[PDB]
């Protein structure tokens, strides 16, 4: 009854006949909700990334923590040199562990 439209067949009739022109071709039907991933930084769970916002919020966590000031400067120093998504995330896990301790 219609052309193969993603099931590979999902018919769609607009309010009137000729009103689907906005979402028929923009494959290429509609920009759907982005998949909320536990690996991509989203408001349902915080994970770091290469953005400067990540470094800033990490420093802010270190400052707001109830951790000693000498150890605060310790992690400051140990942090100034890190670079890389994987090792950033790893140090993040270690930091969560230490502060929850």
């Amino acid at each position: 009854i219609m052309i193969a439209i993603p099931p590979d067949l999902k018919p769609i009739i607009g309010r009137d006949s000729g009103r689907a022109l906005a979402e028929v071709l923009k494959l290429l039907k509609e920009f759907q909700l982005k998949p909320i991933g536990k690996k991509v930084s989203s408001a349902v769970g915080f994970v770091p990334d290469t953005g400067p916002a990540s470094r800033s919020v990490i420093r802010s966590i270190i400052k707001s923590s109830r951790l000693e000031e000498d150890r605060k400067r310790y992690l400051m120093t140990l942090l100034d040199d890190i670079k890389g998504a994987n090792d950033l995330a790893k140090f993040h896990q270690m930091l969560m562990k230490i502060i929850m301790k």
């Binding site: 909700l33 909320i36 408001a43 919020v57 802010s60």
Partner: protein
């Protein structure tokens, strides 16, 4: 006509068009830059044509003067607002404001004359409560040198500057705008030490000397700056004098000093960073979460938005961003939760953004016209849940049945059996086979409650000119063509009253018939909102008369009928999801609303009625209009040929905020419950202000790590949020990811930001709003001296210090009387009273210290600081004066003066309409009196068929007659008289007249009509002289009273006071049932530590409240059915009480209320033997015991003579003020005894059987049949 002084506070939204128009008329060069050249080019072409009028002839001279003077400083520049907002906060000069300087200095000297005595009295009061023998010695110095502190701040000079400028401007405008004198000479450019003001009729021009920066402002800017600076001064003083706010002081000071720096460089967008305050506060509070995965969640998006706004404005560097991050860090990161939420208040103390008109419609025009795609299966499941909820809602209250309900066609035998038998059903079956409900059809079983009251229509609003004449709201000059005349008024109340034929089922029928889709006059318009903090901001909408009426009727129907349906080992944990709700009304659609609209059309009887909004909108064009934003047109064309651009909104689909609110509110829940089912967890919802909150719960095993439970809650809620976002995107509404906050501890609501049981609050929110003039039509000292005390009493309970609040109130009152008496724009203050007051000193301060209910001008008595409501506002103030004269703050003569002051002249009816005031000469409220005198006329001369016959010419006559009959007996009772008269027809008229509000426009209209006599105009405009005359004569009168011995108690004193005062109507007959003892006179206290005795508990006193708190380390964290208007009958009958013969008169007045028989009344009334809280923290650690409190006077089953609630409130107050500073609770546990003794306040009451009737009763000879008035045909 001269009784209308200009406004005294900012109420309009700043608009960068008005100032530009003013200056372009003035032909003064400027530096503003606008988006739309419409206004500029239009005014340019008009002035080129050469049209003008008196206002232009006026505002050209000011420009010529500025042009003349500018040549003195040849390196000047205009600094636009708010790019200039840095200097205008530090501006100052010593010379140009000299008068008010001497004024405030004299005020400070006056205060300093008695500061010591005030401290002595306060310390005595404190010691009386057993809180020690001396306060914390770091307080006395502040209490004494309070004035010096307020003078040694850093905002005093700008405050003086802007206050003087504002008063000068008000004087000029009020003097000129009245047509008494038409000829006028231009003001001259004043001079001074460093500034030079020019005050035109509408603009202010400031030119410094060393900087040569030039400033042009308007009346609104002047008002706003005055308010801002005054608030900053009061708040900084209140933080300085107190100690608890030590580090908060530094924080706020740094915030001010920092953000004030971005203004001269960033520009208007700075208000975005300003608006970024609350989210940052919530994120920094989240930083202390217990599930380490949530830390920084919202913080990441906040920082991303900050970096976005910076990189967009153009600060492409990165070190600046880093430094801003560090600064915000130092500002917000702290260690005290109760102070984490204090920055919430200062969010408004940076001014307001100049918002245009285009960039407000540019947002909604793009958010409305945009296609969408929904999922039929999800929509149907939602509809199924909705139908099920309705089914259960009706199944309750009806024995569990579906009698008038739907009829399925092919549903499964399971669901059909529920209807067949009578049980209920849950969301499970509905979401399981929604295919069942696909095709049901209801049957109307709910009546339209239509004659309940007249509140909705009477709530004042605006309107809009008819569709064919929409260019009326613009003035004549600001267009390129002459507009037409607007005949339809813009006053809802006036249009609704001056009608002739009205009946609500004519509007409903108007909609049902479908005429509203061809009514050739309906129109809708948009207008900006004031006191916003976003350039986009918001708007609000107004429309035409019939459509507005239909809308409010429909809203009342839905909110008065079906709306009430949706009102409502292992344990439960719960997370919290908060999200904003703005820009949701622009995302509904017919396709998603039609199902519920159809179902309501079914269960109400009305066909095709509950979907009118989109059906009418989709063919009507909307636009936003302000008197200085003109549409770029050549000549008048209808509303359709306009191009959809830059002010207008053609053919929208989404709704408009506010309208049909309840519909959306009750239609959104099924999606929530669907997501809840899909995630297998129960939820609850709430909407508080401008953001939805949701609480998702989950069951867990009892014995477990608390942290583990709080982790499991978050784990569940993550999946739940994912599912809910998916479903809402399926339906069409995209719940954004960033703008919501997941938390394990807290959620914001109106009163405060709740957090894990204990509420944190912003105490300093109210202090910043106590000002030198209350908001009224005629500025009145009696009004301002109360507007001060109310805000002080508010700011007290939210955390501040009682003693410092009292001292600041006294200082502000003494500093307000001086301004109202020696520096004002009033014209009645003659030298012959201005001098004899200012020359003397002790008289002035005495008049300023004496309480109000006795005759002075002070509106905050001591007993009010602790309890919420005081007992008897006469005996309270008398005891207050007694304590003052004991502490030697006032001489001895004052007591006799007040006891032998000269009475007034009052009626018999006001004694009933206000049952506590021992009345004095001219102590009324001008605005509150003018309201009624201007209401009664319009309310009596309107032919509306809804209020016919309710208001004859002889209203006041029957009023006074009924009041006299009720009152005059051998024993007077004001309380029952007040209650009955309010619950009778006269009370109905009074309530309607008061509920109907007034304004300057309506008052001026009634004046032009002539509803006020010139005699009354004189009596009103000559008022404020009279309170001063009376206070002078009372404070100078020299009499005595040999019976007065100042050791006689307050109640036995106030009885004599009332009697002597208004004896002209008592003739010696007593006055009973009005006075109770005062709290702070008969309540001693004692602080039981570990190992000591209890002196005042052992010297003879035996009754006392017993409080106990342990050493728990905390303060860190842990034939009648469903009555109708007839209900007044029963309460009135009980108020009259059991009187054998007077049962006749009781029945008579109840019948005048409504049609009821004597037997029905007697059986429906009851019969008695008488014919007469979560604002503090330390409360949750106490254990109150009322063991030894049973000893009350005569210990009877009568109302508590002293109020046990007030006793407990005082106990909790002192127990709180003990631990205000220390974080922990100390070493040991503390007990508190609170004894009372009221033997000197006992009344030897002699309860009479009843006052026999002593007058020939007389009423209206024709019982009224008006529908609204109580039902003369109820059953």
């Amino acid at each position: 006509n001269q009784i209308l002084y200009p406004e005294v506070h900012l109420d309009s939204p700043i608009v960068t068009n008005k100032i530009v128009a003013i200056l372009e008329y003035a032909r003064v060069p400027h530096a503003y830059s606008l988006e739309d050249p419409t206004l500029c080019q239009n005014i340019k072409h008009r002035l080129k044509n050469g049209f003008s009028n008196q206002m232009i002839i006026n505002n050209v001279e000011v420009g010529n003067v500025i042009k003349s003077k500018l040549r003195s400083y040849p390196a000047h520049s205009h600094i636009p607002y708010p790019n200039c907002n840095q200097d205008l906060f530090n501006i100052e000069d010593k010379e140009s404001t000299r008068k008010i300087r001497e004024l405030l200095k004299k005020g400070n000297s006056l205060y300093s004359k008695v500061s010591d005595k005030v401290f002595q009295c306060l310390r005595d009061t404190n010691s009386r409560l057993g809180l020690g023998s001396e306060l914390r010695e770091d307080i006395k110095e502040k209490i004494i040198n309070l004035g010096v502190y307020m003078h040694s701040s850093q905002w005093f000079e700008p405050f003086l500057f802007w206050f003087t400028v504002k008063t000068e401007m008000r004087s000029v405008i009020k003097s000129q705008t009245h047509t008494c004198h038409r000829r006028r000479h231009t003001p001259v450019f004043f001079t001074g030490s460093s500034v030079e003001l020019l005050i035109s009729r509408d603009l202010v021009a400031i030119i410094s000397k060393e900087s040569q920066h030039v400033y042009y402002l308007t009346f609104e800017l002047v008002l706003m700056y005055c308010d801002v600076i005054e608030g900053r001064l009061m708040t900084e003083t209140a933080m300085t004098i107190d100690a608890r706010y030590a580090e908060l002081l530094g924080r706020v000071r740094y915030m001010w000093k920092l953000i004030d720096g971005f203004f001269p460089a960033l520009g208007n967008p700075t208000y975005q960073i300003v608006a970024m305050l609350e989210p940052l506060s919530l994120a920094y509070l989240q930083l202390r979460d217990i599930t380490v995965e949530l830390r920084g969640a919202f913080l990441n998006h906040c920082f991303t938005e900050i970096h976005d706004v910076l990189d967009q404005n153009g600060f492409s560097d990165e070190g600046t961003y880093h430094e801003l991050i560090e600064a915000l860090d130092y500002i917000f990161i702290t260690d005290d939760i109760h102070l984490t939420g204090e920055i919430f208040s200062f969010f408004r103390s940076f001014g307001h953004p100049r918002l245009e008109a285009v960039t407000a419609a540019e947002n909604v025009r793009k958010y409305m016209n945009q296609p969408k795609v929904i999922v039929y299966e999800t929509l149907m499941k939602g509809h199924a849940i909705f139908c099920g909820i309705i089914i259960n809602g009706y199944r309750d209250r009806h024995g569990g049945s579906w009698p008038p309900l739907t009829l399925p066609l092919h549903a499964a035998d399971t669901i059909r059996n529920a209807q067949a038998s009578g049980e209920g059903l849950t969301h499970e079956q509905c979401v399981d086979n929604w295919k069942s409900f696909a095709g049901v059809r209801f049957g109307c079983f709910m009546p339209l409650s239509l004659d309940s009251d007249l509140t909705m229509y009477l709530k004042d609003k605006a309107l809009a000119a008819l569709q064919r004449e929409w260019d009326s709201v613009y003035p004549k000059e600001f267009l390129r063509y002459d507009p037409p005349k607007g005949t339809g008024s813009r006053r809802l109340v006036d249009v609704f009253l001056n009608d002739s034929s009205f009946d609500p089922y004519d509007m409903i029928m108007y909609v049902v018939s479908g005429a509203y889709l061809h009514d050739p006059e309906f129109n809708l318009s948009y207008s900006l909102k004031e006191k916003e903090i976003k350039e986009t901001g918001r708007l609000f909408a107004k429309m035409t008369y019939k459509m507005r009426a239909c809308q409010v009727i429909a809203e009342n129907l839905i909110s008065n009928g079906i709306g009430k349906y949706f009102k409502d080992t292992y344990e439960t944990v719960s997370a919290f999801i908060t999200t904003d709700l703005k820009k949701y009304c622009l995302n509904w659609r017919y396709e998603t609303i039609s199902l519920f609209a159809q179902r309501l059309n079914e269960i109400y009887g009305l066909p095709s009625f509950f979907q009118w909004l989109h059906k009418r909108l989709e063919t009507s064009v909307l636009y936003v209009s302000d008197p200085h934003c003109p549409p770029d047109l050549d000549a008048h064309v209808p509303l359709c040929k306009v191009p959809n651009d830059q002010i207008f909104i053609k053919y929208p689909m989404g709704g408009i905020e506010g309208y049909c609110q309840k519909l959306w509110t009750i239609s959104t829940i099924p999606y929530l419950y669907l997501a809840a089912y899909e995630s297998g967890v129960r939820i609850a919802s709430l909407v508080q202000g401008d953001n939805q909150t949701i609480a998702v719960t989950k069951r867990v095993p009892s014995t477990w790590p608390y942290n583990l439970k709080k982790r499991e809650a978050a784990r569940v809620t993550r999946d739940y949020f994912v599912i809910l976002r998916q479903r809402l995107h399926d339906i069409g509404h995209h719940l954004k990811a960033n703008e919501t906050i997941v938390s394990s501890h807290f959620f914001v609501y109106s009163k405060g930001i709740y957090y894990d049981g204990l509420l944190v609050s912003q105490s300093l929110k109210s202090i910043a709003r106590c000002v030198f003039w209350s908001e009224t039509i005629v500025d009145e000292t009696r009004a301002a001296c109360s507007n001060i005390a109310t805000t002080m009493a508010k700011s007290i309970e939210r955390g501040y210090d009682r003693y410092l609040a009292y001292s600041l109130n006294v200082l502000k009152v003494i500093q307000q009387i001086l301004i109202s008496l020696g520096f004002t724009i009033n014209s009645t203050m003659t030298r012959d009273v201005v001098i004899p007051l200012l020359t003397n000193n002790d008289l002035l301060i005495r008049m300023a210290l004496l309480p109000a209910p006795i005759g002075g001008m002070n509106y905050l008595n001591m007993s009010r600081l602790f309890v919420r409501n005081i007992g008897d506002p006469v005996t309270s103030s008398i005891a207050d004066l007694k304590r003052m004269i004991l502490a030697s703050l006032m001489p001895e003569e004052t007591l006799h003066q007040v006891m032998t002051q000269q009475p007034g002249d009052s009626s018999f009816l006001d004694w009933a309409s206000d049952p506590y005031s021992a009345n004095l000469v001219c102590v009324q409220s001008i605005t509150r009196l003018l309201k009624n005198i201007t209401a009664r006329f319009v309310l009596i001369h309107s032919p509306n068929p809804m209020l016919k016959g309710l208001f004859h010419d002889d209203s006041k006559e029957e009023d006074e007659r009924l009041a006299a009959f009720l009152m005059d007996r051998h024993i007077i009772v004001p309380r029952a008289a007040h209650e009955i008269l309010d619950h009778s027809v006269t009370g109905a008229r009074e309530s309607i007249a008061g509920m109907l509000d007034t304004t300057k426009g309506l008052i001026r209209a009634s004046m032009r009509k002539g509803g006020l006599t010139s005699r009354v105009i004189t009596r009103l405009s000559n008022y404020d002289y009279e309170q001063f005359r009376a206070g002078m004569v009372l404070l100078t009168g020299r009499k005595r009273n040999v019976l007065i011995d100042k050791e006689s108690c307050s109640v036995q004193l106030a009885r004599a006071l009332r009697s002597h005062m208004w004896a002209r109507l008592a003739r010696g007959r007593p006055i009973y049932g009005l006075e109770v003892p005062d709290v702070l006179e008969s309540m001693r206290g004692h602080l039981i530590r570990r190992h000591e005795t209890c002196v005042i508990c052992e010297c003879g006193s035996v009754n006392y409240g017993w409080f106990f708190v342990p050493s728990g380390c905390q303060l860190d964290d842990i034939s009648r059915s469903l009555r109708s208007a007839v209900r007044i009958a029963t309460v009135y009958s009980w108020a009259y009480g059991d009187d054998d013969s007077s049962w006749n008169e009781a029945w008579l007045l109840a019948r005048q209320r409504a049609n009821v028989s004597l037997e029905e009344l007697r059986v429906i009334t009851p019969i008695s033997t008488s014919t007469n809280t979560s604002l503090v923290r330390v409360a949750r650690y106490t254990t109150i015991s009322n063991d030894n409190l049973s000893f009350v006077i005569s210990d009877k089953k009568v109302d508590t003579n002293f109020i046990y609630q007030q006793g407990m409130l005082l106990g909790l107050g002192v127990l709180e003020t003990l631990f205000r500073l220390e974080k922990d609770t100390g070493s040991s546990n503390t007990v508190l005894h609170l004894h009372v003794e009221t033997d000197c306040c006992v009344i030897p009451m002699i309860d009479h059987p009843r006052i026999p009737s002593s007058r020939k009763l007389e009423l209206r000879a024709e019982l009224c049949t008006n529908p609204l008035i109580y039902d003369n045909a109820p059953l």
